[PDB]
Amino acid sequence: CCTALCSRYHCLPCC
C-alpha cells in the first residue's frame, strides 16, 4: 500500500 494504513484510504492493500 502507500504507507501502513491497510484501510481503503491508502492505496487499498495492506502495508
Please give a structural write-up.
The protein is 0% helix and 0% strand. It contains no helices and no strands. The N and C termini lie close together (5 Å).
Strand segment count: 0
- Per the principal axes of the C-alpha atoms, what is the gross shape? globular
Task: Tally the helices.
Answer: 0
Measured between the Cα atoms of the first and last residue, the distance is: 5 Å
Disulfide bonds: 1-15, 2-11, 6-14
Subcellular location: Secreted
Organism: Conus regius (Crown cone)
Family: Belongs to the conotoxin M superfamily.
Compact summary:
Its main location: secreted. By secondary structure, this protein is largely without helices or strands. It has no helix or strand.
SSE layout and pairings?
Blueprint: no helix or strand
Protein name: Conotoxin Reg3b
Subcellular location: Secreted
Family: Belongs to the conotoxin M superfamily.
Provide the descriptors you would attach to this structure in a database record.
15 residues; little secondary structure; 0% helix; 0% strand; Conotoxin Reg3b
